[PDB]
Amino acid sequence: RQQVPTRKDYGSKVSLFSHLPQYSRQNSLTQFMSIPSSVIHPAMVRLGLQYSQGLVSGSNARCIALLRALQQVIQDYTTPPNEELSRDLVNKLKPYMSFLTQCRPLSASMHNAIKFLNKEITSVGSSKREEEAKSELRAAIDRYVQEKIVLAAQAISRFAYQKISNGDVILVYGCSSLVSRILQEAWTEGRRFRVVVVDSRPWLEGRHTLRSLVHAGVPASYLLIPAASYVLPEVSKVLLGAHALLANGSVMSRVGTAQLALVARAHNVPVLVCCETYKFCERVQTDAFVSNELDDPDDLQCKRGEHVALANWQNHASLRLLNLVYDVTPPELVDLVITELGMIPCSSVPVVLRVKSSDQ
């Protein structure tokens, strides 16, 4: 009741990933909660419902949605008479983040936004009036969105405009708002090039990118990830988006990004990664097994012909479906990172963090 019930695991997991949760999109957490939202703020409940159903996906979109929900929560916050805002607000936000984690494991951008907001709340003077503190917090969140995402995207697009050349064939993977914006603004500014969109099952997010590239008039080829080795002889540049950059330089991205980096290295093709500095993390990962997300295994079912293989796959005791979400590209497979600070080597992630931490 007062604590949100834990989400149930869907099915059997791979033994190497048995430490990670595995949830079913159909089994939502709101089945055992009061419709007039108590315990959890209604904005947070709606956000978690959108997360668990995949309605909101992508690092930037998830971070922006979380920040808007947090603004709504702050706006409707009343300080208890025997409590201070700087502590009570931080204590109150924690169950909301736990519920959001239950709905879907938080992305790196969401974690960094949460840390920034907690730091901002803690640094509120006890003498400030409640409404002044709330207005300052909302203004801080607005500034965070404006500077860490929008202006950062514009600066990254301006920087990446230099790398794109006339006659280039740029290979992009999946859906990334930053990559799409970079390509659209490069096409608008007068550069002429082709884009090859590599997509993979089961999300097929690359189609999104494809649609955008046709609305902007950019010529675009489309193919699946296993055929990448066939198309890379034509490709002159690989441009990838990153969900996170780890402190050791590793690129945590959608599964298959490291695969594309490896095949591109085998084909002697430069690999560039576009990421905003607000998504840099102090964690380190050496593989995709230690920390990852296991999506719904049922998404791996496919409609081939009249029959459906893997239907009722849970009836086979030895059968496991592994719907990995993320993967880690080692820094040796990445040639360049484009951030709002400019073009940096993949090993400059720890210093940039430091530069962004001495201020705070």
Partner: protein, 346 residues
Amino acid sequence: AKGSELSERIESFVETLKRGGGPRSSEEMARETLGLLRQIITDHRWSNAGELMELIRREGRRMTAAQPSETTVGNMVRRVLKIIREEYGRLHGRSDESDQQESLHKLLTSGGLNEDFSFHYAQLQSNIIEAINELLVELEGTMENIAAQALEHIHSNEVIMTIGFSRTVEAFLKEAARKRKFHVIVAECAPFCQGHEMAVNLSKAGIETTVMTDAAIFAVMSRVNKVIIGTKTILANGALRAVTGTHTLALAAKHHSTPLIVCAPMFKLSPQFPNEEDSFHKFVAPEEVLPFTEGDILEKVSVHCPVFDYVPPELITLFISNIGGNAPSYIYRLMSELYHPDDHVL
């Protein structure tokens, strides 16, 4: 009778090759090609071995041009041509064979060859038919011979990665699983997700199996001990024409120095080098990759769906065939004792 049925069967085979092929496996393709060539030898009228070889080559050219990606037909045609050459040389008084047929430094230094197939021998046809029957008998047991080597390449609690659906690899793994316990990870090999079926059958045998998309090959390769794959064709330099996504799997295995084992029978060996010919990949309709229901987006988007991938020999560790295990560096020898260099181009 003879011609009216033989020509009809040839037409049916060519038309089946052109459009579809059905659920026919590589072994079935080879058996049907061998039966076709045996009936051509028996029914058609040929005086000497030269006329028979010319007729066989003429039929094989059409059979190969029907579907270039189906290399088993050409392999069987060239095998029959080599059999005819061997029988004729045996009846022509040349003592030992299969060594002077191939160009060799020792043969070049100590003489040479002056081929002539004009002579007629009445016992040539029976010898050729007997050799073809031996070839068919070997075909009937090549799969069992390959599967019998399972326990020599799998240890306890090993993680084996495979891609696509290969019946040879399935039999190999099922034979190994009788006495050993191991975990198999199957890549689905999109868009034709045959790997799913490969995972179901391996699950029915009690093997702990895991399915994953082709995007997770590199991520999971770090915890994979061995890679066992099938192939469609083995080229003259040891390279592979495998299902799509196999080159990526081979690169991922090479990154972690994971051994890559190819379980392929003898009839999949083709003497064609991967020089060019623009006939390597087989591009199926792009409906599998991008659905037709996408809409206007399809009028400006170039969708390509290659079926096969070229795997260079550097990424292959071992070839397991009905004759045992070989390195990719020895494949050339298996060329020379199976096909004649003059029969490389039909």
